[PDB]
Amino acid sequence: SYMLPHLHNGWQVDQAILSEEDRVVVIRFGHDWDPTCMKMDEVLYSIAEKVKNFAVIYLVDITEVPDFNKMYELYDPCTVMFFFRNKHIMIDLGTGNNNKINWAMEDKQEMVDIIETVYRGARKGRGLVVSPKDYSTKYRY
Amino acid sequence: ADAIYAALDKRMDERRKERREQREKEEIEKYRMERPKIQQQFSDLKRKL
Amino acid sequence: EYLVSPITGEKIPASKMQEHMRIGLLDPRWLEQRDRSIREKQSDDEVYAPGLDIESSLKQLAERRTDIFGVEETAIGKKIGPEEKVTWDGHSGSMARTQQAAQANIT
Amino acid sequence: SERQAEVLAEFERRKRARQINVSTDDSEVKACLRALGEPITLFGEGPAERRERLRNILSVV
RNA sequence: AGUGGGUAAGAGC
């Protein structure tokens, strides 16, 4: 959470999205004090260095930066957005909401797979990438 | 008009607002009696720092 | 003393002799590898924020998470214990309206 | 043309550079570089880089 | 009983 870089106004978010030409921008929209946001923060920080080559991590507090809440439906406790060359990328996670990752994922390997699949799909010019692992079921048994 | 509606809602929510907030405060104090805040458990070491 | 380098054939003193050998056969591709190592080291980008940002982020979290910090225990996300920003809805039809609202937002 | 001539000239210049003896003593290298009229250290270069610079300077002259 | 978990992405007109 506190380790990852933080963006304070919407213009900084725009500059961060624009300035990345060959890396996928992963932005966590939420509140640093939210436990689900805390899980996203800890997972991202765990894999913030492994995927440095083909990704970058930014943290945005939607209370101090509400400028996207209307347009990006930033109302879930924690959402994850992927961008490539100033273009939001959708992921067919299987949950019915391809626009964002609105839930907390425990496994960092799953998030690394998601980021790599997003990079592969968006590099090829595609706008929607099929997630390697289905998420229509939590597989709890 | 939004201010008037909000004042209306606050006035109506004030039926037991003070009672239940006092109850919540008492329950919070009872819970913290045996389980202090995390920064409280480190306050002494923090001062020694 | 004076010794002849077996790889160079020059009269060199014995005091530096062993050292003269060590940096005598040094492979220039080692210099190349060191150069590429320092270039890739300078090619890194700060993945994590500096100390000021981390300290400020912890202060902000503490101001909100009173169940972990502070003295007064409020709810999970409350700090205690005019102008409202207008945001685009992502519709091209309202682009002009948002633009003129931002223009009116000027000082 | 001039392109082949210049690239060949640099080719044999490098070949000459590979076949020139330079002392491993840092002090003697510093004295030689000072005698040649060039600064000893180039923006905080390493001793190996200093030796390479001296070798190239000797090759050119 | 029941909603969903069933948006292909792209090009400018």
3-state secondary structure chain D: CHHHHHHHHHHHHHHHHHCCCCCCCHHHHHHHHHHHCCCCCCCCCCHHHHHHHHHHHHHHC
Rounded Cα gap, residues C100 and C98, in angstroms: 6
- A97 nearest nt, CA–C1': E7
Give the range of the structural domain holding residue A34, as residue numbers without chain letter: 2-136
Q: Is C32 on the interface with D (CB under 8 A)?
A: no
Contact at 8 Å (CB) between A43 and A98?
Answer: no
* Helices A35-46 and A108-123, packing angle to 10 deg: 70
Give the determination technique: cryo-EM
User: The domain spanning residue A53 has which CATH number?
Assistant: 3.40.30.10
Contacts of C85 in chain A (CB under 8 A): 66-67
* Contacts of residue A65, Cβ cutoff 8 Å, sequence gap at least 6: A7, A8, A9, A10, A13
Is some CB atom of chain C closer than 8 A to the CB atom of A69? yes
Cβ atoms within 10 Å of A48's Cβ, excluding its own: 19
H helix or E strand, kind and range, residue B32: helix B17-34
What's the length of chain B? Answer: 49
Number of domains in chain A: 1
A55 contact partners, CB below 8 Å, separation of at least 6:
A23, A24, A25, A26, A115, A119
Q: Is the dihedral of CA D18, D20, D26, D29 positive or negative?
A: negative
* Residue A107, domain member (yes or no): yes
Q: Which of C45, C58, C87 to mutate to test the interface with A (most CBs of A within 10 A)?
A: C87
How does DSSP classify residue C92? G
Q: Is residue A37 part of a domain?
A: yes
Residue D50: alpha-carbon gap to chain centroid: 8
**Reduced 3-state DSSP string for chain A:** CCCCCEECCHHHHHHHHHHCCCCEEEEEEECCCCHHHHHHHHHHHHCCCCCCCCEEEEEEECCCCHHHHHHHCCCCCEEEEEECCCCEEEEECCCCCCCCECCCCCCHHHHHHHHHHHHHHHHCCCCEEECCCCCCCCCCC
Residues A7, A81 contacting (CB under 8 angstroms) = no
- Cα C22 versus chain centre, distance: 37
Q: What is the resolution of this structure in A?
A: 3.7
Plot region of A4 (φ>0 → left; ψ -120 to 50 → alpha; else → beta): beta
**A66-85 exposure pattern, b = at least 16 Cβ within 10 A, e = fewer:** ebbebebebebebbbbbbbb
* Residue whose entry in the numeric block shows the structure tokens 């020059």: C10
Measuring from the CA of residue A128 to each C1', which nucleotide is nearest?
E9
For A60 and E9, how far is CA from C1' in angstroms?
27
- C-alpha to C-alpha distance for D48 and C28, rounded to whole angstroms: 9
Asked if the structure places residue A141 within a domain, the reply is: no
Shortest alpha-carbon distance between residue B40 and chain C (Å): 8
Whether A40 maps to a domain, the answer reads yes
D47-60 and D2-18 helices, crossing angle to 10°: 120
Contact A57 C90 (CB under 8 A): no
**C-alpha B6 chain-centroid distance:** 22
Contact: chain C with chain B (3+ CB pairs below 8 Å): yes
Question: What gap in Å lies between CA A133 and CA D18, rounded to an integer?
Answer: 57
